[PDB]
Symmetry: C3
Subunit: 597 residues, 3 copies
Amino acid sequence: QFRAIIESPEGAGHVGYQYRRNTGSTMRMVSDVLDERVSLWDFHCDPSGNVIQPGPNVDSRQYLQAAIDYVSSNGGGTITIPAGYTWYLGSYGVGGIAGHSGIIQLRSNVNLNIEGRIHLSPFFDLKPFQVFVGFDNGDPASSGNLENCHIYGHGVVDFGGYEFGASSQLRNGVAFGRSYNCSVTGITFQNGDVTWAITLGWNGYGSNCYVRKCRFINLVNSSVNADHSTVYVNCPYSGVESCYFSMSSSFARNIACSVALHQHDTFYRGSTVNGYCRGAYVVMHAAEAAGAGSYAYNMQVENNIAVIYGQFVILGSDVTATVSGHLNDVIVSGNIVSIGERAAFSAPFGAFIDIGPDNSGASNVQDIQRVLVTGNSFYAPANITDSAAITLRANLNGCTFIANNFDCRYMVYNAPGTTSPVVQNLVWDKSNVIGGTHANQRAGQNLFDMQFASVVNSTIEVQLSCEDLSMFSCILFPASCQLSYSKITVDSAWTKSMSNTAVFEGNQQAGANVYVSYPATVNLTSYNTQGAVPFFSTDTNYAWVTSAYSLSINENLDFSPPATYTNKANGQLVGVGYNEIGGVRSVSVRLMLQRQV
Amino acid sequence: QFRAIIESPEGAGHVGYQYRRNTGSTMRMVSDVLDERVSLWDFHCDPSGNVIQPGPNVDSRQYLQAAIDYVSSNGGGTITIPAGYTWYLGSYGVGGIAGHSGIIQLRSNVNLNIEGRIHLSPFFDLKPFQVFVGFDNGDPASSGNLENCHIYGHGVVDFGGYEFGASSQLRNGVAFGRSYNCSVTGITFQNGDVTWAITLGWNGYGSNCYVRKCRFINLVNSSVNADHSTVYVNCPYSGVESCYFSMSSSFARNIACSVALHQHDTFYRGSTVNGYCRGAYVVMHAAEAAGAGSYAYNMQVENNIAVIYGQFVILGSDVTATVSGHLNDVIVSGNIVSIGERAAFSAPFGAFIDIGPDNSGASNVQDIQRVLVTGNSFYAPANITDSAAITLRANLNGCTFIANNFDCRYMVYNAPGTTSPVVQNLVWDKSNVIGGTHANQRAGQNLFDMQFASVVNSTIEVQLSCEDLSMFSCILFPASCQLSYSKITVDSAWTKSMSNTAVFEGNQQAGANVYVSYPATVNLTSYNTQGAVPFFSTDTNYAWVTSAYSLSINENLDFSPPATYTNKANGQLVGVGYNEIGGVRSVSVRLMLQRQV
Amino acid sequence: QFRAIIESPEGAGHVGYQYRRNTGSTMRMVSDVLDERVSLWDFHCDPSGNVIQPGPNVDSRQYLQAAIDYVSSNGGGTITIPAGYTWYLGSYGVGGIAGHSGIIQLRSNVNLNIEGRIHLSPFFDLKPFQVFVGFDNGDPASSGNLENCHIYGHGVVDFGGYEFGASSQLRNGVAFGRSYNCSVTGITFQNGDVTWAITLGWNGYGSNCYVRKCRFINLVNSSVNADHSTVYVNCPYSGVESCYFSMSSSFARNIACSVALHQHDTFYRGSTVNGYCRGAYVVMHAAEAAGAGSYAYNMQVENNIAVIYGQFVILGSDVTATVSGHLNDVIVSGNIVSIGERAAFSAPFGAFIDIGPDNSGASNVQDIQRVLVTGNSFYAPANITDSAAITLRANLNGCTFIANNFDCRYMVYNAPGTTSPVVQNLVWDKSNVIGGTHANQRAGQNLFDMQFASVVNSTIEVQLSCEDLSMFSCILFPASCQLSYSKITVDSAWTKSMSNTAVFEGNQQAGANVYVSYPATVNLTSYNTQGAVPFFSTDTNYAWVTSAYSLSINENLDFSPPATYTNKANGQLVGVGYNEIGGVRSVSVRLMLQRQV
Ligand code: NA
Ligand code: NA
Ligand code: NA
């Protein structure tokens, strides 16, 4: 009677309890207290209610779904996935997540505390999957929201090492969906060939979604995998902090990016990356602009550590038939980034910043401006010819560089022939320090290679900190690049032996609102006159020069050339020196040529 | 007999347990294991011990207080506020928190894990309240400390949307009191009209208090609300990290600040703000200097993202009859900040840094120095006339600006008439990049408007990066501003067409220890002499000029003006050019005027 | 019968339970649910299974070890150390941790949630100890790994205040061993005289180990203690974030460092330090290079707040018979650091950066390069003569300084006599702001004191922001320092009254590839000639000068000196001025001397 009730499932509901024997505390039953927590064990049972042990040959999916569905029905809670066990998933979910190749459906206010391990069984080999899906509809546009869903703990999600079956397939760990106040904290995602580990939001719908203190380990493994971004941030007021990302496959060096920031007010901070092609995309895709507008603004990449093989930050924006995307108000700061040991040209072109074309290769759709790149370090090994502070491959409406340290082959680069970007407001402050690792490697190359259609309202203040006499020039403009309302200077330090410092193939430095200064060697010849006497340049290509001054000592006693020069209508320089004794003088002098500065 | 004991409240204390059947484990009873945790359910009961369900019509306050008081009596623990329920509070607390309009009294070592929702009932409508109070006395000065108290979880505190009843009232979420090692992590505070969500410390008493990963949503809603700072940090070695703050009301744009840092060794990092008037106050109030001294030092605002309507960082210090407050050793870095879309003058004057007067409007009490503002971005839309890198409205003893990007109407500003601050050690390094969003908007305005009583030991190195010919001047000193032992330079780039570059209305640039350089147009006339021949300025206002040099080309063949000039006692410039053929020459030239540089 | 089973230890395993009466949930027993968690109470029992109360006279060690060992046997879990109790440890462990003076042995996948207090009993007074040890062997080289071990909670580890018995002894809180994915979060370590609180890794073996939100309070207390680094990071992909470190003893000001970063891809962020000698070591020790290679790279110290008495960041690398250590790719950024109030020379020499000799004092073994120091603030009080931006005491292969604010006695320093470092690639950008706290204190001192064997490929761009006429020179090279392929400039602002600006005791500024500019006063005398007329310097020590220009006004009406000068073979300067009326002129002028700039 009483014995029977006690051994029944209702037994615990008949045993009284009062907290610490406190007479002022609730008189409850044991079952009530045990009902304050919930684990997968409370649903991991056969139809008669007997517990099932997890393992390689047990598909845990329906049991976890039942737990989620039930806790959802009570307004939420946290389900623990117990430590000490590996819980295998072995079949697809059903309903609104089947269109997403979903395994488990997440539900609002239902948190998962993953302390044990979740493993994918070989049912998923060569197939698509998205392990945790927060959509409730096959069509994301008719999906409801996922709110207040947190996954956390010390546990693991293991994708079982299976390769993709076909490049067209997609694979994900956590697809939060149209997600609001959702997060992943503490979890290790490992051992896969996937497209993403976590995606946050859906085409701008969502808010307040975060990935923190997670580890992502070896999540690309095959030539079949088309592309990878480990965390894809597709809702605003969201981001990634204090994570670790590591890949070891060769394929990852060519296709994988750690983070993609695709909506406004998003961030990527304090994370360490190794073995990836790319650091972060920061891109406003017009096809993803439904939920939070057409502008990506307030984008922050800060205080990360990366060894990569391709590009650290990739900026973009694009358009559709009905929507134009814009990118502005970005800060990239405090990051320390290297291109890993590799042969030149063996992975995508190495870059700290890349201004990339759209997915169809168009370089004339972008609207990127008000970007600040400051207080970062970049290094590439001396053999990596394809390394640049910025590869400027598409139209740019502004990017400002202050107080960085760049130590790679090029400072500014774009390939000739290719795209001919239209450039406005590119600012390279004199406080950017140009390293010398690539000294002596730059035969035939221009340090700032300005292979653009045009440059306007831009500043390039070149300052070397060691010699590199192998380079063709410090900065070169082809004749095809228009240049106006710009300031281009080359500091003389470490330049005395350079044949070419600044080169303007179309004589663009003569423009009315071009402000330039650079060293040049000039031959001069004086009149015979004893006393104050003019010296004039033998060459006539200085009609643009507003002043020039001596960078050379005067080895002579009997005369001195002018310290300073102006020009004449015929393009000669002229200055007044001094003949202590008369005679025609002929000298070769290093001058700082200046125009309007 | 046995049946009776088992169904009694002591029943669980009669059922044996040994962990996982391990014979080396303690032989315990069920009640002992259940006593390892505690929830509000263990106290949320009527006088007969029957559990009460929470809800809109149940006042949960006495039950939560009883739980806190009891756990306190045992040396501490963590009380869980269960998920899946909304727990309403409906009356004020009693005792030492009644003077603070307290609801719940916090106690040392007693943590709250808020997984469910705490809601305020309409009893609090139009009234003051402070939901959680750590003071044990009505008079904070005779209060004991609160130590080792942490509030955390995925839950919510909802202030029920009630407006303030009167501007004089105060409202708070968590008043920690004289708090040591206390924190709030993970909680969402929403739906209110309050003064603060969380306050840390009391007039410098406290230490090691933090707010992390909390969200603060819509916490100002009425014209009645006098003021708001979401987190007020009033103890040292304390701060705010990785939080989200969002307001939507119009009133918030005029009164709300996200954080106030009021004691030394405090920080505000990695947080995102939207819809606020202000970012952070960083202020040493002499009236709050009892617990940690008279100095606010080691103040850090870093790596935040903000869209605001007024000022990002507001610096101050003030005095009382017996105490003077000082502010020094501050760093503001890596932040990306915008003034939101708004009409000019429709909210408090937009600023990245504001040096504010005291609460009584006094601008002659402040002692603010050794501030570093570096590697930040600031943007204001082109129509916002009231936008400045710094509004310098009170005495300043030092502020240093390096490697920022400011894109707004003014760089340095203070309104004329108003306060006449005394300025020392203002440093504006050439590495600050001046954006061009406000180009063409600056009719009648000075980019650096130096409306001060005096400027000493200061550096302004102005560098433009595009043209703006609408501005009256790059920098202007009224005749009322003394200027000494200072360096003021205007780079020539994008200045060739400017009528005025630097303006010194009192001819202050002639001071003995003033070091200045800027472009000017000058008319000159030569002697008739063939050969080396002097040119002299027609105007006599260059007695302060130590050298000048040509910024113009020479369109002539038969002569050249001097490349470089010095002056004469009468205030003319003079240099030696060259007449190939003789004749009096008359030319108009753009020169860089220099004094002691 | 049934009564007997129920009161036995197996009783709970006979009482049925089904979660919330849900008929689809597992039919379990109470014991199963209680077995989901585990605490120290489940092992803190006598041999008959009766629970023992912890306290001062109970040694809790064997019971905690038994708990750890058992949970380990089940594949892991989290053991809670209950709140409300102090758990004393009173004897050493046995087995593989005895060689490490271990107390408790940590085991893989076994987490400790420390909510209560762990205290050391006086058995440990005057003895060595390491409280938690992750090694399983006395010899670390034959030790197995510790993986997936996390210690966290709101609890405390108290070292009981005992002094060290002898300087040779070692003491530690948590020695993780060869540790992979291990962490400490939330814990307060206090009240000791120890060598370290936490060590991560062993001679480069380990990965993904972190210390977050921990507090470290008063952990050095005696003159006996040889040395202290609070967190020692000796494995890669590891670091310290958001911690608090505080010492109050005088001894700590001379021996204690907060963090030591000893392997690649390690970081120290967002932490606050007070009362320590040092901030962080960043050092590649060749004796510790077994597990992760010979290079420390990707080292990050960012956004910390410190008041220290010695040096903030200390860089090093050294060698053994068979291994050479290298240090490169380091970033030190956003930190705000002060030397605390102290007498000059009363603690180790104050420095923001120190390039230190090896432990045997050798300054010729180091290979340190590609370091970026940017956007930091440093302050030392005016009386602290021993304060420097960088003490450069050992060979340096590169360090770059951009956009810092340094306000201390020296900018660059090394003591004369002592080491004679070989310096390459030291870069001091003009954007570093030199504060004026030490103005008037620098009698007999050189601001940049270049006491080196040699300097190559280096840049020193000195910019003052106030006067300090007490200093002997802005920069001085002794004749013993070679200088080549370098750029050394002194901006003229605030220098007009300085006798010496740049000093080159060996006339090193004449070198072929030395690029220098600085102010000097020069006496000149003209010829008699009316009209354009040469002026020449009376002194002949300007054979290295390529140009010079006037920094002085001309008080004369009847003549003007040249605005600009070049030199002559005999070392005189010469320029062409203008005599309106003839006569020999004699003037004393302030010039900017330039060489190849
Ligand atoms: Na073109
Ligand atoms: Na005045
Ligand atoms: Na030497």
